[PDB]
Each structure stands twice: as structure tokens, then as C-alpha cells.
Design a binder for this molecule. Structure first.
Ligand SMILES: Nc1ncnc2c1ncn2[C@@H]1O[C@H](COP(=O)(O)OP(=O)(O)NP(=O)(O)O)[C@@H](O)[C@H]1O
Ligand SMILES: [Mg+2]
Ligand SMILES: [Zn+2]
Ligand SMILES: [Zn+2]
Lengths: 258, 655, 665
DNA sequence: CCCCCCCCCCACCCCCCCCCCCCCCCCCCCCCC
DNA sequence: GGGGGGGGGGGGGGGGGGGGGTTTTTGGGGGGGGGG
């Protein structure tokens, strides 16, 4: 932070910030009488990107189905927005206490109203309390690039050579279909269809604005005796950006959007 | 060597920025005086390639409109004295402050005593080259000029806000000089300058001045936010000329300053020194306007003897055949003339159309095209439309804690079209909400103590499949489809769309479809200019008039032209209606009613509208009769359709 | 009024556009009439800021970035012209603007000082004006690795080429000006946060002392950057060959440069005396000792558990404390009942020179990188091996004259310069037999002793405590050297008669007054006293006659007040204090004078687990001292119950009972 | 099996505090014994 | 040469002023259950 005094144009700068919005206590000018009358210089001061994200205990890690415990994680700078709602993530960073900044005294804010700690001169009669939060310096998830260059130029040269040895093969088309749903026997036509669904058509926009669908819609009619759901389990396990749902369990709203 | 109050610099010195920061450079008074001369020179001597000063013409127009706003194109500043464009991007709060004074000086030069009409001018920057999504805003954008897109989610009322405010100290000599009010913070008076001490203060009564104010919540557009992620938003503040340039639910593109301020509430609840943020708007965009030459182009093409047919062929050009649907859509999209008989009886001008027919016959695609082409449009498929979501609804206002109205689709599309795809899939309680807005052209809510009537001037175009999923030409209409007579009668053109196997017709259609697919393939003088030229080359293969021209032509014909009936073939329309009524006594047939008689007149007026003709000719009326009679005849079962078509031929094959 | 200020700033901004700028055809290009513009800016400095005592141009020139964005480009490109041409050889004109740029750099980098004589405007503008000099120092060192430094040496070489006979007064001035540029660039250092004291302090004090502008970090200003850029521009080579060529108009600035290098760096840092990681592990273990100590001073259960101890005293009365651990340890309970007091006795307070070893925090090291350490140590090694004796002889042959007009800054920098290099060469020679004590022989030539004695005696008589402290430091290193050359062997006998009588008395009276002054003042007094005592013992006019002048209570008060800082003192300093106590108490047997409760408390606080390192040699000495001290105190109390009360007070200067108190018959 | 109903959930005084002023206490310096 | 007295600075205390301090109805959507 950086501040210019009200009664003289002198500037305080590189003012470190506590959890409360922190302003200078003394004027650097030995002539000046000021304390605590300031204007923040927005241009000289430096901000950082900041984002709180709330996380809850993993569903498969709760011991006996009781409530999951929660925590507040602060992301900053380049690490913001790498999380997403419903994502399963691993963070690393600092476990920190965050005070009740209202209780600590704050410009323009009346204080808030567990037993805290008191006697600290900033508090006078008030008693300060703390939440835990996690100041995360790093994030990863643990749970369409449709141009050749932006895809290829991310690959390892080993992967490039595997791609070349695949396209070299004149009859790779059969090898692809036999690689679909390898745990289910037979039914070559269905496997061919699923291959030609993960490989979609080319979506088009006409001069009049009218769109043409690129996606391919497939139906697999089968008796409940048939190994039918294996195809859905396979493709939802395999294909990126996909979901499984049951016909009667899901309503019209639940299917499109509610 | 020089008078210090008039010391000034060269342009290369201005590129030679040597303050610590851009704002420190703009405010350095020798630099500031030079910047004033620089922007003034730009507004004077920048020209179109025709040699006309653009900003001469715009200033001329500004005064003719008595406007407070001067539209400046950023690219014109990037094209000449580009250092000023860089400064404008990096430091807009100072630079616009200078540029406003320059714009006022320029128009005062061009229009003496414009200070009496407006004391100030705002330069409204447009065509700023770089765009962000609301998800994409970051710290590095703070106090920069930004360009953002979103949907206006919530618009507050229009308020006066203080602009220049003097204050009274209750001690000493009371009056304090005028502070300029901003969009984020109250004026703080730490001490009174006249007695150099703290004190209480009040706004001064001798003089103060006000400007309009309005906040808008701008949110990520629903198709633009990635799926699963939540929509981000920001508060946009509109001042002076900009208030009520948008209304809730409209997608807009906003140019403004991304600013921030300390807010103890945000800090209090988050526990970090984290600031609230806004966009202070400097321009708002919703494409359907036109130039004087564009107006002349509409007048030119309107003279063509084939213009109705060229328009009709141009409706949904990438859909083969279905010229009856294209005619019905054209008539609906131009509309009739709404009338009011001495104020004692108001009559619908909108034409409602139903596309009833078999699967895979481009009905949904036609509706999506009309959503593309109409100047105000809304689209709502089947089960996705509730009764109150179509007309209007009442909500317990979350910030006012009282009941307020929310306009449905037929409010949003008022003076426009509403597009209900898969109309047969609606719940009947949802469907029957349509009735009042579809004929009386209003919505009369009376709920929760609210009692009022809204305007709903929509032409509704709907697409439906027959009962069981496919048509049956051995059944009359009322047995093909579950819709009742009061709703069928309101759709005053009916198009029945049958998918029949027919060898050469399917040959031609399939040829057209595969041609369309290669003609729509993505891979199929600067490069951008060449590509737009190639797009025009592709388009003229199937559209007899340009689609971009067609949209503005439709909007022009709608807003300027109001064809009168005259020289009316009253006996012909009377005999047509009388025969249609008599032959409609067949119990299942399309239920001919007086609103169909008025529909003939609406359709004739729409055809005269297509010609930009303020009088309805006999050709317009004859085409209208042909459409309505063919629409009636086409709906009949095969057992009687030949006999009926032969009987009605005297009215229509005379044309 | 401020209208004059905005007129001024407008003029300086226009001049900033007149100097020059980049050319897109990127290269910097001079402006038209560039020499006239530079001359006019130099004129502005003299015309306004000097003659009216303002510094307003010095502020405006920083606002419009003339130094960073014109003058350094001009000098660096001119250096590139000359250096590229030198391999291949209208330079006769561009040389003039290069010289005038260096003049302007010496002006804008001129060391600012504020005093009572400085104007109101100057003392107002001082704090922010310093910040721009720090930006200048950063830019000068960093820009193209500091190629402007190579421009400066080229401007100097262009008079060093013409002979000692040839160089005119203007050429001599130009060389001196280049030395002032190097001195200034070394000398810029962050300013002090000068608070106004009219209005009382709030419930929180000053938020931070940091004065650096936001584009500067202290690493940009650190000696590592100076040494790196000077090595990469061969500034060290220039200085070494310049002092090699000393055969004296420029001698004062050259001395001053060596002072400004040395003034804040400790000699032992240049000598060792996975290794960094191993030492980090050692540091972590050392603080882990403090962890296992504070743990015993911490509650085993939460703070609200709150069991109440009651201390019944030896009398029929009771005190109460909440210390959960204190329930089982009356030591904790007693010192907590003491710390509980809201009362504190009120305590008392207590410029034209820079910070240095004279006034830094006692442990304040400079953290060299290894390459910068090598470059610096080899440079000062070669300086000692070439330039020391001649430069010291030159400046002392001056300074024997004009002592009356020797300004205080000049005095302190001279004494510190002498002391630092004498101490360094002693240390390097104690490390390497290859390094020779006689390579600093000029220190011992009697003219030097006479001058340093005159400076110390005059400063003491004049009550100039700053120069007094510096002369005391210089005396310490002089006596250190003298003891070494006493072992290495006539001059030792000579000075050992010259420091008789008045010099004994003066040196005895420094640690009488020293207790009133800063920790470093006291430290230098103690160091001098130990050096004096070991010198006089090495000699051993009478030994008892001299040491009796030291063994008196004001000296003991200085020693105790110095020793109060024991947590922050170094182990060798505690050793020195306890060796003094060893002599005074055990050997000289004036043991009555140390039976006083201030020492008793101090002994317990450092022998407590919260005190010294368990394995420290100084802890061993304090323990060894304390056993004997307690035995002697026990004996004296058994022989005198009056001394149970006498322990509380200064001993009785009424000799008729004072002798009995002192010895007890 | 489909449609309609109906059910559910949701929106003026007193204390703390801060500033200002006055007096007292403690240190330092100068004079006297 | 040391002790007392006088004078100046600095700190602390006291006083005065100021500001802060949930059920009930209505409407809408979605889900679940029952009857033809
Ligand atoms: N005449 C045509 N020309 C071009 N494409 C056509 C034509 N008829 C149908 N199509 C294509 O058929 C597809 C489906 O069109 P669509 O608008 O959904 O038909 P629809 O009439 O709405 N059938 P439905 O939704 O089952 O009632 C689109 O991709 C169109 O391009
Ligand atoms: Mg459809
Ligand atoms: Zn100030
Ligand atoms: Zn006032």
C-alpha cells in the first residue's frame, strides 16, 4: 500500500498489510502534524489476485457417513481459478489463523457482536478470535483444442512417433474398433458406432447463421439379458466430458436444465 | 525562453514518456497542454478516405441531436497519433478528462453557445480492440480501460447523483469549494481548510449540481460460461447519458474503466484487505441501424417488380423448398399495421404462424433463423416454457421486500417475435397462457395485490408435430393435432409440412443439402477483407439480397412504413371469407373465424410493407388471398381437397 | 509560494525534453543544442538550489527522470563509441557532453546532509529526496552492468594519459570529480524516518522504518551489487593503479572512497574462521535449545485451566498467581510476581555523517556472495599490498596541518579508515604467514600516533563524542598493532613512554564517562581498556599506579551496563569483560567494589537456563567466576552482617568507615 | 401408461476511547563550600 | 571535588468531549402419487 497525507502532499510507500486494511500511523515529513488522515494512492499501491475457495472432506473418506468437515482455502496470483465447483483437488501451502478483522478494529466498520483473547492494546475491551484457513501456493485437480498445431505441439516426441506408427498402418480402422470396450465380447457394429461417436462429425455454421449438428446420436436397443450397459460404463469411463444417467431416475428438468 | 503557462512539447516528446507513471505524465501541465492540442488536432484533421473530417460530421450530428455524447472510434486514434491511443488505454480517467474538454471546445467551435445546451461533452470510446470476459478480469486491469460482454441481470432505478458539491462547515466561514463526486466513495472532509480543523459538514444550499445514475449487474452470458462453472458478475455504473440504454435480460458489450475501492464490508466478511470492484461504463452496446446510403439502397431495391419474391426466396436461404413457410415467415416478420379505431377499439397488427408437420422438415431450423433475423426475438422450446415464464410473473423482491413484476418472454419480445418450438410438447396450462398476449396483445396479471396490464405486441411463430408424431392426410386438421379451436384460430396462418417420398423432389433436395454442407464447411487487400468477400461470394449463390441488408430492410420496413388499405376489392374479400366460412363447416377443418378475415388484411399490409409501399395494391391483396386460401385448402383431407381447391380457384388462380 | 514551484517543475520538464531521446531509425540520440541544455540544467542547480538553499530542482529532476532516461544513456553510448573506436583508432565535441553528464551525475548524487543550518525547505524535502538518490544508485549499478562506470574511468584515463607534469588544474579537477562520482555512488544509503514529536505517540507506534521507493529493494543497494558492477567494470583495477601512481591533489577523495567501502563491513566476514546447509543445521539446533527452555516456561494444559497458586511468604501473609507450572516451582512464581508489576521507571533519550561500525547494531553483518567476497577481499588485499602506506602518509602529511579546520566528518572518516585496515591486515597476517605486518608500517610512524593522539585529545576536550569514539577505536587498533610488533621484534618503547601521564589519565577517563552512551561507545571503551591493560602488562610507569586509575566505581558501572546486553553481546566480549573482572576481583583483590546487587541479578539472569549457551566458553568463564565470587561474598558476609545491607548500596566514600567496609580488619 | 393433482420447499443515557493540558518529577548543569 | 539548588524537559494522570449502541401467506417450480 501507499498513501498521501491530507495536510501535506508527502507519500508513504511499501506499507505492508495485515489482515485489516492498514494505514500509516506517522507522517514521514518532520514538519507535519498528521496521524491517521490519508488518501490511498491506487496507482502506486500494488494489489494481488485473491480468491477464497471452500473445500469439504472427500465423500469416500468420511468414516461412517456423518457430516463432512470443511475448510477455507485462499488462492492468490497465478494460482486463482484453477479450482472449480465439484472438482476434487490437492493443494499445498500454509495452515494459518485468520482473525476476526472486525473485532480487531477496522475503518468504516462497527465490530462484531467462543471466548477470545484480550488485553492487546488494539482491542481495548474486545477479545479477538481466529478461524483456520489454508493459504495455498499451488493447486492441481485429481478428479476443444480443435487445430492440429495446438494439439501436436504439446506432445512428447515419443507420442509423436506412436501417432506416426499408427497412421502408417493401412488397416488401423479395424484395430480401433477392436479397441472399443475390450471387456465386452462381440457386437462389432456397436463398437464401430461408438468409435464413430467419439469421432464426431464436423460441426458447421451456414452463411444464414443456421447451424448443422456435428455430434452423432446412437441408440443401443437390447434386452436386459444382453451385456448392454457395459458400453455406457466403458464410454463414460473412457471419453472426456461425459456422464451416466438412468432413464426413470432422471426427470425432464434433471436432464436439460432446472 | 517561453511563457511557463503555455510551454508545450512535440509529439515525439510525448512518446518519450519520462514521469514515473502514465498518470503522472498525463497530468504534467506542459504534457497536458500538448495532449489537448493533440486530441484537438485529431478531431479536426482526422478524415475518412473521402476526405471528410469524421469528427466534423459527428460533431455536426451531435448538435443536431442535442446529445451530450460524442462517439469516438479508438481505431481512428490508433491510426493517427497512436501514443494518445496508448495513453487512453493505460490511463483513461485522466485522458478522458482531457479529451472531454477538447471535445467540448471542438463542438463549441463548430456550434457556438452549445454551452447553453450542455455545459459538458463525454467522449464515448468505441471499437476498443481487446476484450475480456468477466471471469477473465484481473488485478492488472485495475484503472485500465476494458471491454467486456455480459447479460444485464438486474437494473436499478434511475437516480440523481451529486456531481459538483460545495459543503458547509458549521464553524468559521461556512462555504467550502466544489468537490467532484466519483462513482465509488463519499467526499471525505478530514478538516475544514478555512479553519484547518475537524468538524461536522452538510451539503451546501447556495449551489450544487446533479447527474443521472444507475447501477447494473452484468453477468456472464449463459452460453459463454463453461458448463458446471458458476456465472461471474460485476457491478456496472451508468452515468448521465448512459442510463436506461439497456433493460434486464439483454446481452450487452460494455466499454469502461475497471475500478476498485476499499469496502469495510468485503474486508470484514473475508478477513483480508480485499477491495470491491466495478466497471464505470463509458459505452454500452446491445447492428440494425443504417446509414443514408443504406437507406438509399433499401429505396433502390424496393422498386424491383420481384422484390416480394426475392425477399421470400431470401428467407432462410439454406433451407430447400417450403416456399409457403418462407412466405408465412416473411409476412409474420414484416407484420401488418396495428390499428386503433378512435381509441375505442384496438386491433392486432401482428401475424401469428403455426408450422405443423412431420419430423426432419426444418421447422426448428426456420425458427432458429427467425431468431437470427428479427430485431427483437425470444425462443422457448416446449417443456422449457412455463405459463408465467411466457407472459409475466410476480416475485417477492429480495432487496425491497415487496412484490414486483418480472416480464416473461412475451414482454421481452414486445414489438418483436416470440418463437415456441415443439409447441405440441407444452403442458396445456402453459399453452393457454398465450391467449391474451396472442390476440389482445397484452398481459393482465392480478396477483399478490399487483393489478396491471402489460404490453405484449408479439408475432408468435410456433412449430409442432401432429398427434402420434406424424401427419395423416386421411384425417381433418382437428384430428391431426390436439390443439383446440381458440388457440388454432389465433395462429392465423397455418403451414402443414408433410414429409413424403418423391423421387425427383428428394433428388433435388438431397443435392441442395450436400451442396449446402460443402458450402458451409469451415475451411471453404488484407486477409480479413478477402474472407468477408469470400463469404459474400458464397452467400449470393442462394440469397438474392444480402442477409445483412435483409435485416436492416426488415427493421426499416417495420418502423417507417404503415400501408393503408385503399380501392379495396371488398366484394372479393367478402366472397372469399364467405366461401371459406361455408366450406369450413366441415367439423374437423381449420376453424375459419373473423380473426382470419382480419388476417387477410394483415398479410396484404405486410406484402405492401415488403415493397415499402404506403398503399396496399391489388397485387398485395391477391397474394394475401392466395396465401390464406392455400393455407386453408392445404389443411383439408385428400377426400375433399381437389374439389375444394377447384371451387376456390376462381379467387386465386385469377392471379 | 507554490506557483514558483510549478513554474520551476514546468521548466525542468521542458529541459528534460530538450536533452535528447531514442531514435526509431533502439539507440539513444542527443538533442539539438544538447551541450547548452546540460549547461543550463547545471546552471539551475547553482542558480536556484545552491544559491537559494532549496533542493527544488533536485526534486524536479527526479520527477522528470533526466538521470535515468537521458544522462546514463548518453554516457553509456559515448563509452561504447570510445571503446569501439579504441580497438580501431566528432568525438572532440561529444566528449564535452560526456564530461558535463558526469558533472550532473556528481551533482544529483551529491551526499545530502541536514543540520540546524539547513533551510526549512531542505529539511522538509530531505526524506523523499534521499529516495531518488537510491533509485539513482540502483540504476547506475544495474544499467548495462554499470557500463557508465567504465565511461567514468575513461574520462579519468583521458587525463591520466597526460603526465603528472602535463595535467592542468582543470585536469586535476576532472580526476577529482571522477573520484567524487565513485564516492557518491558508494555512499548513497537509505534515509532515516524522521518523525515529528510535537504531538504524542498513539496507542501503536511507527508502523515501519522502511524508506525505499517501490521500484527499489535493499538487495539492489547492497554491497554485493556495488562489488559486482565494480568488478565487471574494473573499477577496482582503476583504483589500484591510481594509488600505485601516487607520486596528491586528489588524496582526500581517494581516502574517502576507501572509508566508504569499509565503513560498515566487518573484517572477519571475509574469512571462514554442504557447509552452508551444515551451518543452517547448527543454527536450527541452537534455537531448538531455546525451544526446550521456553517449553518449561509454558503451561502443559490450556490457558483457561487456571489453577491458582498461593505463595505464603516467610511471614504470615499470602500472595497469589495463576502460573500452572509455577505451582511446582517458586522460582517461576517469584519472577512472575515481579513481572506482573505495571510500574516501570521512566528512561531517557540519547546528522552530518553516515551509519557505520560506529553506530550499527553490534551483530550487523554484510552478507557477501562468495564471488563478491573474493573480489572485495582480493581488491583490498592488493590495496594493502600497494596503496596503504603511501596513501596514509599522504593524507596524514596533510592532516598534521589544518587540524583546526578539519570538519567532523573528515575527522571520523579518517580515524575509521586507519582503524579498519590496520585491524584487517592484523587478521589476514594472523591467518596467513605470507601477509606482512610491515605492509601497514605507516600506522606506526610517530607522526601518525601524534595525529591520532591529537584528534582523540581534542575531541575529548571539545566533548565531540563522535570523534572521541572514533579516535578510541583507532587507539584500540594502534595498540593492537603495537602489541603485535612488540612480539615481532624500538617504536614500542617510544610510544610506551609517550602514552605516560596525560594519556594514561585520558584513557582512564573514557570508561568513566562511557556508561552514559550507546552500546557501541561502551564496547569500544571496554575494548580499548583490555588492549591498554594487555599492552601495559606486556611492558611490565608503575603497573599498579596505572591500573588503580581504572579500578573505580564509574568504570564498574560502564562494565555492568555493557554487560546488561549479554544476550546480544558476542562470546569474546563476555570473555573480555570477565577477564577484566578476573584481574580486578581475583588478582587485584578490590573485591568489595563488586559486592553490589546489580551484578548479582545480572549473574543469575545469564546463568539461568534462559541465559547463556550451555556449552559456551563464556558460560564456563561466568560459572568459574561465580563460584569464586559467591565464596568470597559468603566469607565477607560471615565476617560482616553489615554487608547484608551494604550489598544494596554504593560503598561508603567516607574513608574512616570506608576502609573497614572495604577490608573488614 | 399418461395426465392431472397435490404436495413440498423455498424466498437518551452510559461506556469506551481518545485527545489535550498541566503539573510534577527527575536529570543535568553550575555554583558554593 | 562533591553536594545542593535551580531550571528545563518529558512523562503521566485527569478531565472533557464524542460517538455508538420467526411464522405466515403467496407464488412458482419440480417431484411424486393416484385414477381412468
Ligand atoms: N429442406 C431442407 N433443407 C435443408 N435442410 C433440411 C431441410 N429439411 C430438413 N433439413 C435438415 O433437417 C435437420 C432437422 O431440422 P429441424 O428444424 O429440427 O426439423 P423439424 O421440422 O424441426 N423436425 P422436428 O423437430 O422433429 O419436428 C436440420 O439439420 C436441417 O438442416
Ligand atoms: Mg423441431
Ligand atoms: Zn503530512
Ligand atoms: Zn471550518
Amino acid at each position: 500500500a501507499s498513501f498521501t497525507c491530507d495536510m501535506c502532499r508527502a507519500i508513504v510507500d511499501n506499507v505492508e498489510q495485515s489482515f485489516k486494511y492498514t494505514e500509516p500511523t506517522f507522517c514521514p515529513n518532520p514538519s507535519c502534524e498528521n496521524r491517521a488522515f490519508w488518501t490511498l494512492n491506487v496507482t502506486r499501491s500494488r494489489f494481488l489476485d485473491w480468491q477464497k475457495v471452500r473445500i469439504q472432506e472427500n465423500a469416500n473418506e468420511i468414516p461412517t457417513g456423518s457430516m463432512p468437515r470443511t475448510l477455507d482455502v485462499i488462492l492468490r496470483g497465478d494460482s486463482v481459478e484453477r479450482a472449480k465447483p465439484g472438482d476434487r483437488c490437492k493443494f499445498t501451502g500454509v495452515e494459518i489463523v485468520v482473525p476476526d478483522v472486525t473485532q480487531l478494529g477496522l475503518p468504516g466498520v462497527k465490530p462484531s457482536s467462543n471466548s477470545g483473547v484480550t488485553g492487546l492494546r488494539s482491542l481495548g475491551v474486545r477479545d479477538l478470535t481466529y478461524k483456520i484457513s489454508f493459504l495455498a501456493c499451488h493447486v492441481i485437480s485429481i478428479g476443444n483444442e480443435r487445430d492440429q498445431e495446438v494439439f501436436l505441439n504439446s506432445l512428447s516426441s515419443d507420442e509423436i512417433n506412436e501417432l506416426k506408427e499408427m497412421v502408417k498402418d493401412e488397416h488401423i480402422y479395424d484395430k480401433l474398433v477392436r479397441s472399443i470396450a475390450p471387456a465386452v465380447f462381440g457386437h462389432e457394429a456397436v463398437k464401430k458406432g461408438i468409435l464413430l461417436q467419439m469421432l464426431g462429425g464436423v460441426h458447421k455454421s451456414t452463411v444464414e447463421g443456421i447451424k448443422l449438428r456435428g455430434d452423432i446420436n446412437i441408440c443401443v436397443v437390447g434386452d436386459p439379458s444382453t451385456s448392454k450397459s457395459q458400453f455406457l460404463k466403458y464410454v463414460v469411463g473412457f471419453a472426456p466430458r461425459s456422464v451416466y444417467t438412468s432413464g426413470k431416475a432422471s426427470s425432464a428438468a434433471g436432464l436439460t436444465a432446472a | 525562453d517561453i511563457d511557463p503557462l503555455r510551454e508545450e512539447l512535440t509529439l515525439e516528446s510525448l512518446s518519450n514518456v519520462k514521469a514515473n507513471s502514465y498518470s503522472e505524465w498525463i497530468t504534467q501541465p506542459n504534457v497536458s497542454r500538448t495532449i489537448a492540442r493533440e486530441l484537438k488536432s485529431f478531431l479536426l484533421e482526422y478524415t475518412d478516405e473521402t476526405g471528410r473530417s469524421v469528427y466534423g460530421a459527428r460533431i455536426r450530428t451531435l448538435g443536431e441531436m442535442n446529445s451530450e455524447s460524442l462517439e469516438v472510434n479508438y481505431r481512428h486514434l490508433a491510426e493517427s497519433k497512436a501514443i494518445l491511443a496508448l495513453f487512453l488505454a493505460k490511463c483513461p480517467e485522466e485522458m478522458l478528462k482531457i479529451f472531454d474538454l477538447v471535445a467540448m471546445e471542438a463542438t463549441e467551435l463548430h456550434y457556438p453557445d452549445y454551452a447553453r445546451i450542455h455545459s459538458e461533452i463525454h467522449v464515448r470510446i468505441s471499437d476498443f480492440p481487446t476484450i475480456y470476459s468477466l471471469r477473465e478480469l484481473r488485478e492488472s486491469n485495475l484503472s485500465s480501460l476494458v471491454r467486456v460482454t455480459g447479460v444485464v441481470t438486474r437494473r436499478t432505478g434511475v437516480f440523481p447523483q451529486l456531481k459538483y458539491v460545495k459543503f458547509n462547515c458549521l464553524k468559521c466561514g461556512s462555504i467550502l469549494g466544489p468537490f467532484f463526486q466519483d462513482s465509488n466513495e463519499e467526499i471525505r472532509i478530514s478538516f475544514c481548510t478555512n479553519c484547518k480543523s475537524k468538524g461536522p459538514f452538510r451539503v451546501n444550499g447556495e449551489k450544487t449540481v446533479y447527474r443521472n445514475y444507475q447501477r447494473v449487474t452484468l453477468q456472464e452470458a449463459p452460453g459463454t460460461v463453461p458448463p458446471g462453472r458458476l456465472p461471474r458478475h460485476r457491478e456496472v455504473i451508468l452515468l448521465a447519458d448512459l442510463v436506461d440504454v439497456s433493460k434486464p435480460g439483454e446481452e450487452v458489450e460494455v466499454t469502461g474503466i475497471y475500478k476498485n475501492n476499499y469496502d469495510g464490508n468485503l474486508n470484514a466478511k473475508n478477513g483480508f484487505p480485499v477491495f470491491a470492484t466495478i466497471i464505470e461504463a463509458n459505452s454500452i452496446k446491445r447492428v440494425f441501424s443504417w446509414t443514408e446510403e443504406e437507406e438509399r439502397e433499401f429505396r433502390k431495391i424496393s422498386r424491383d417488380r420481384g422484390i416480394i419474391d426475392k425477399i421470400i426466396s431470401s428467407m432462410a436461404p439454406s433451407i430447400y423448398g417450403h416456399r409457403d413457410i418462407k412466405t408465412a415467415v416473411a409476412c409474420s416478420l414484416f407484420g401488418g399495421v396495428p390499428k386503433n379505431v378512435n381509441g375505442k377499439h384496438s386491433i392486432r397488427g401482428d401475424i401469428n404462424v403455426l408450422l405443423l408437420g412431420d419430423p426432419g422438415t426444418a421447422k426448428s431450423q426456420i425458427l432458429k433463423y427467425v431468431e437470427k433475423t428479427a430485431h427483437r426475438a425470444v425462443f422457448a422450446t416446449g417443456q422449457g416454457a412455463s405459463a408465467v415464464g411466457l407472459t409475466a410473473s410476480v416475485r417477492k423482491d429480495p432487496i425491497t421486500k415487496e412484490w414486483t413484476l418480472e416480464g416473461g418472454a412475451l414482454v421481452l419480445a414486445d414489438k418483436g417475435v416470440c418463437l415456441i418450438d415443439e409447441f405440441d410438447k407444452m403442458n396445456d396450462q402453459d399453452r393457454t397462457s398465450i391467449h391474451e398476449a396472442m390476440e389482445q396483445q397484452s398481459i393482465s396479471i392480478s396477483k399478490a395485490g399487483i393489478v396491471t396490464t402489460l404490453q405484449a405486441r408479439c408475432s408468435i411463430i410456433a412449430a409442432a408435430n401432429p398427434n402420434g408424431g406424424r401427419y395423416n392426410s386421411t384425417l381433418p386438421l382437428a384430428q391431426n393435432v390436439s390443439l383446440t379451436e381458440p388457440i388454432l384460430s389465433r395462429f392465423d396462418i397455418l403451414c402443414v409440412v408433410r414429409d413424403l417420398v418423391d423421387e425427383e423432389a428428394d433428388e433435388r433436395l438431397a443435392t441442395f443439402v450436400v451442396d449446402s454442407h460443402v458450402r458451409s464447411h469451415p475451411e471453404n487487400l488484407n486477409a480479413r477483407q478477402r474472407r468477408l468477400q469470400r463469404q459474400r461470394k458464397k452467400e449470393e449463390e442462394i440469397s438474392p439480397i444480402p442477409q445483412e441488408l435483409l435485416m436492416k430492410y426488415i427493421h426499416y420496413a417495420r418502423t417507417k412504413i404503415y400501408p393503408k388499405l385503399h380501392q379495396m376489392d371488398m366484394d372479393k374479400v367478402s366472397r372469399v371469407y364467405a366461401d371459406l366460412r361455408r366450406e369450413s363447416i366441415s367439423t374437423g377443418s381449420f376453424p375459419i373465424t373473423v380473426r382470419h378475415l382480419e388476417s387477410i388484411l394483415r398479410i396484404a399490409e405486410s406484402f405492401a410493407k415488403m415493397r415499402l409501399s404506403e398503399f396496399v395494391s391489388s397485387y398485395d391483396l391477391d397474394r394475401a388471398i392466395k396465401v390464406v386460401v392455400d393455407s386453408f385448402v392445404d389443411a383439408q383431407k385428400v377426400s375433399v381437397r381437389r374439389q375444394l381447391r377447384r371451387s376456390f380457384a376462381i379467387y386465386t388462380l385469377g392471379h | 509560494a507554490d506557483f514558483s514551484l510549478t513554474v520551476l517543475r514546468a521548466r525542468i520538464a521542458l529541459l528534460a525534453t530538450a536533452i535528447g531521446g531514442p531514435d526509431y531509425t533502439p539507440p539513444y540520440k542527443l538533442g539539438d543544442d544538447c551541450l547548452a541544455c546540460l549547461k543550463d540544467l547545471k546552471r539551475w542547480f547553482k542558480l536556484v538550489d545552491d544559491q537559494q538553499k532549496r533542493w527544488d530542482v533536485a526534486m524536479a529532476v527526479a520527477e522528470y527522470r533526466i538521470l535515468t532516461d537521458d544522462l546514463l544513456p548518453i554516457l553509456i553510448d559515448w563509452e561504447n563509441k570510445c571503446s569501439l573506436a579504441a580497438k580501431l583508432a566528432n568525438k572532440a565535441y561529444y566528449d564535452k557532453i560526456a564530461l558535463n553528464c558526469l558533472q550532473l551525475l556528481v551533482l544529483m548524487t551529491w551526499p545530502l546532509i541536514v543540520t540546524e543550518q539547513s533551510s526549512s525547505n531542505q529539511i522538509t524535502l530531505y526524506g523523499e529526496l534521499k529516495k531518488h538518490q537510491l533509485v539513482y544508485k540502483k540504476t547506475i549499478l544495474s544499467m548495462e552492468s554499470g557500463k557508465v562506470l567504465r565511461a567514468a574511468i575513461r574520462l579519468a584515463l583521458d587525463v591520466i594519459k597526460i603526465d603528472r607534469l602535463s595535467r592542468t588544474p582543470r585536469d586535476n579537477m576532472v580526476l577529482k570529480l571522477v573520484l567524487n562520482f565513485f564516492r557518491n555512488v558508494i555512499a548513497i544509503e537509505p534515509g532515516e524516518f524522521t518523525i515529528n514529536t510535537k504531538k504524542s505517540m498513539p496507542k501503536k507506534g511507527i508502523t515501519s522504518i522502511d524508506t525505499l521507493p517501490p521500484n527499489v529493494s535493499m538487495d539492489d543497494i547492497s554491497l554485493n551489487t556495488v562489488i559486482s558492477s565494480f568488478h565487471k567494470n574494473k573499477v577496482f583495477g582503476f583504483l589500484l593503479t591510481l594509488t600505485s601512481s601516487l607520486s596528491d591533489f586528489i588524496n582526500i577523495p581517494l581516502l574517502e572512497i576507501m572509508f566508504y567501502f569499509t565503513k560498515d563491513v566487518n573484517q572477519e566476514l571475509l574469512f571462514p574462521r554442504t557447509s552452508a546447509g551444515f551451518e543452517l543445521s547448527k543454527l536450527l539446533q541452537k534455537e531448538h535449545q531455546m525451544r526446550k527452555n521456553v517449553i518449561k516456561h509454558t503451561s502443559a494444559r490450556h490457558s483457561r485451566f487456571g489453577g491458582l497458586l498461593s505463595i505464603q511468604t516467610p511471614d504470615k501473609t499470602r500472595l497469589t498467581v495463576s502460573g500452572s507450572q509455577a505451582l511446582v516451582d517458586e522460582k517461576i512464581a517469584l519472577q512472575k510476581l515481579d513481572d506482573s508489576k505495571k510500574w516501570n521507571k521512566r528512561i531517557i533519550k540519547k546528522e552530518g555523517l553516515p551509519n557505520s561500525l560506529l553506530n550499527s547494531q553490534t551483530g550487523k553483518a554484510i552478507f557477501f556472495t562468495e564471488s563478491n567476497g573474493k573480489h572485495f577481499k582480493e581488491f583490498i588485499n592488493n590495496f594493502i599490498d600497494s596503496g596503504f602506506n603511501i596513501l596514509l602518509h599522504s593524507v596524514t602529511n596533510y592532516f598534521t596541518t589544518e587540524q583546526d579546520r578539519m570538519v567532523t566528518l573528515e575527522q571520523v572518516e579518517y580515524l575509521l579508515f586507519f582503524a579498519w585496515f590496520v585491524k584487517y591486515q592484523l587478521l589476514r597476517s594472523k591467518i596467513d604467514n605470507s601477509a606482512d605486518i610491515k605492509q601497514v608500517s605507516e600506522a606506526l610512524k610517530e607522526v601518525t600516533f601524534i595525529l591520532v593522539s591529537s584528534l582523540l585529545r581534542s575531541a575529548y576536550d571539545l566533548k565531540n563524542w563522535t570523534v572521541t569514539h572514533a579516535g578510541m577505536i583507532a587507539f584500540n587498533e594502534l595498540l593492537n598493532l603495537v602489541s603485535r610488533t612488540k612480539a615481532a621484534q624500538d617504536i614500542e618503547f617510544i610510544v610506551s613512554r609517550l602514552f605516560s601521564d596525560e594519556r594514561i589519565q585520558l584513557l582512564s577517563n573514557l570508561p568513566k564517562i562511557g556508561s552514559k552512551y550507546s552500546l557501541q561507545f561502551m564496547k569500544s571503551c571496554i575494548e580499548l581498556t583490555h588492549s591498554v591493560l594487555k599492552v601495559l602488562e606486556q611492558y611490565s610507569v608503575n603497573f599498579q599506579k596505572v591500573q588503580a586509575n581504572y579500578m573505580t566505581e564509574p568504570v564498574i558501572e560502564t562494565y555492568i551496563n555493557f554487560l546488561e546486553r549479554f544476550r546480544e553481546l558476542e562470546d569474546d566480549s563476555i570473555k573480555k569483560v570477565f577477564s577484566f573482572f578476573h584481574r580486578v576481583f581475583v588478582q587485584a583483590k578490590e573485591q568489595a567494589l563488586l559486592f553490589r546487587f546489580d551484578l548479582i541479578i545480572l549473574l543469575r539472569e545469564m546463568l539461568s537456563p534462559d541465559g547463556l549457551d550451555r556449552m559456551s566458553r563464556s558460560r564456563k568463564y561466568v560459572s568459574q567466576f561465580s563460584d569464586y565470587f559467591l565464596a568470597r561474598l559468603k566469607k565477607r558476609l560471615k565476617k560482616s552482617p553489615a554487608w547484608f545491607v551494604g550489598l544494596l548500596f554504593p560503598p561508603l566514600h567516607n574513608s574512616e568507615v570506608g576502609f573497614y567496609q572495604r577490608y573488614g580488619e
